[PDB]
Design a protein around this nucleic acid. Structure first.
Ligand code: 0KX
Ligand code: MG
Ligand code: MG
Ligand code: MG
Length: 433
DNA sequence: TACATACAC
DNA sequence: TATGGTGTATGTA
């Protein structure tokens, strides 16, 4: 079963239009459309002489990148399929051959592929999703299970790269280069696994990943998809290609890299989001070769780091070694609620959040100098207000002391109107080096 | 240092 | 009735 690609957007708009949420989404779209219009004003003021001057600067840098292109590493991205929903499907048979999503009626974490055919997706509210699919089954989340399932897969992955990078519970990057070296001359004993009556996997990168996905399915009863490529950026993209329950390899030769990139929409790259797509689209840029073609223009319209990034993407480049993410930069907590307008209640809720945050800091023995409150009113508009201090702070009292005054300032500023808020949050940052 | 925006899960 | 939460990067002032 399923729905129509056009029936869907009609039901969403019909369900969402008029809400305070939609009002804020319009306010954001206008703010983006204006930011596009400003970029187009600059494109008109760009001279053919400037374009030539930049083109010569870009290609000089592009040659520096191209000559340092590293194809000697083998990078695997593993990504669980419909992760949360797959777990709930695994442990309740009644949800076999049925559309489901994990979450509440207010919000969904994810949805299984059956339900995806109706247009129900991650980050969608349940009440909207039920309009799209009345038979939809919303099952409450069990994060503790998901963490436990994750732990099972992370244990398998550690055989192939002990320094693998877990991006989240369902997701990881592996550098299997060093494993492939050792494995080249392994006996069938060291790469044989029994079915839950046994099987052997080859010496190749494709085979190594078939073993990983198999061992995962055997240990957890859940499928994963995987991507294989000479860098992280490519690997991530490939893992999505034959999803669910499939692989893809970009072989480690320059030509194959380029063939894959040629007509690849830039959205699919990790870091190109909804906005960057819409901005670049207005410059006629959709695919990665179009992104290469316009590289000069981009070096005049965007900041150094952004066009440097776009160039890496346009040449099929990316990170080839996994850096153990070291010290953290911020710790935070925030919560949504039904409207709170009484000041005394807002101080109480601030104090609560500061306590929870101090508790989380205690766990990692951390102290910081910057305390930042986050306030979101009933029309979904967001303010952050910060304050940095000489001496590091950490206790619930110390953090609350600072956040109290920031919140006071904001209540005082709108006076005599009360703050009609729907979410508050507190963040700490500026830990010592 | 302060604030907003964009992005990822 | 209803649109969640944590963390990093970065552009600007
Ligand atoms: N916005 C989001 C995105 C994901 N998640 C959770 C639910 C997902 O199952 C899990 C992993 O994210 P994900 O890999 O992007 N999606 P999911 O594994 O469900 O489907 P696939 O597209 O990978 O098959 O994080 C969330 O709670 N909020
Ligand atoms: Mg996934
Ligand atoms: Mg994921
Ligand atoms: Mg993207």
């Amino acid at each position: 079963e399923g729905l129509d690609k056009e029936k869907i957007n009609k039901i969403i708009m019909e369900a969402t239009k008029g809400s305070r949420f939609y009002g804020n989404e319009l306010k954001k779209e206008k703010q983006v459309n204006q930011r596009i219009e400003n970029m187009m004003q600059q494109k008109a003021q760009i001279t053919s002489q400037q374009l030539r001057k930049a083109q010569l600067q870009v290609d000089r840098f592009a040659m520096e990148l191209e000559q340092s292109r590293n194809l000697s590493n083998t990078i695997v991205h593993i990504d669980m399929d419909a992760f949360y929903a797959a777990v709930e499907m695994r442990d309740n048979p009644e949800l076999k051959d049925k559309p489901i999503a994990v979450g509440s009626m207010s919000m969904l974490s994810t949805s299984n592929y059956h339900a995806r055919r109706f247009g129900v997706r991650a980050a969608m509210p349940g009440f909207i999703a039920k309009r799209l699919c009345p038979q939809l089954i919303i099952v409450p989340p069990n994060f503790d299970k998901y963490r436990a399932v994750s732990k099972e897969v992370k244990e398998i992955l550690a055989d192939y790269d002990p320094n693998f990078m877990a991006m989240s519970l369902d997701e990881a990057y592996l550098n299997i280069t060093k494993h492939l070296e050792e494995r080249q001359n392994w006996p069938e004993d060291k790469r044989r696994y029994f079915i839950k009556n046994s099987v052997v996997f080859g010496t190749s990168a494709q085979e190594v990943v078939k073993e990983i996905r198999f061992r995962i399915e055997q240990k957890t009863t859940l499928t994963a998809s995987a991507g294989i490529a000479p860098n992280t950026m490519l690997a991530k993209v490939c893992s999505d290609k034959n999803k669910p329950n499939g692989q893809y390899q970009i072989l480690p030769n320059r030509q194959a890299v380029m063939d894959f990139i040629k007509d690849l929409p830039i959205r699919k790259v990790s870091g190109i989001g909804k906005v960057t797509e819409k901005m670049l689209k207005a410059l006629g840029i959709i695919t990665c070769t179009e992104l290469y073609q316009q590289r000069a223009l981009l070096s005049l319209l965007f900041s150094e780091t952004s066009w440097h990034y776009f160039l890496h993407i346009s040449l099929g480049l990316g990170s080839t070694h996994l850096t153990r993410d070291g010290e953290r930069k911020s710790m935070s907590v925030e919560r949504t609620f039904s409207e709170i307008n009484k000041a005394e209640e807002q101080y109480s809720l601030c104090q609560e959040l500061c306590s929870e945050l101090a508790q989380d800091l205690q766990k990692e023995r951390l102290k910081g100098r910057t305390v930042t409150i986050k306030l979101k009113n009933v029309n979904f508009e967001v303010k952050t207000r910060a304050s940095t201090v000489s001496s590091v702070v950490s206790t619930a009292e110390e953090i609350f002391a600072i956040a109290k005054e920031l919140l006071k300032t904001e209540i005082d500023a709108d006076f005599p109107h009360p703050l009609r808020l729907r979410l508050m949050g507190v963040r700490i940052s500026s830990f010592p080096n």
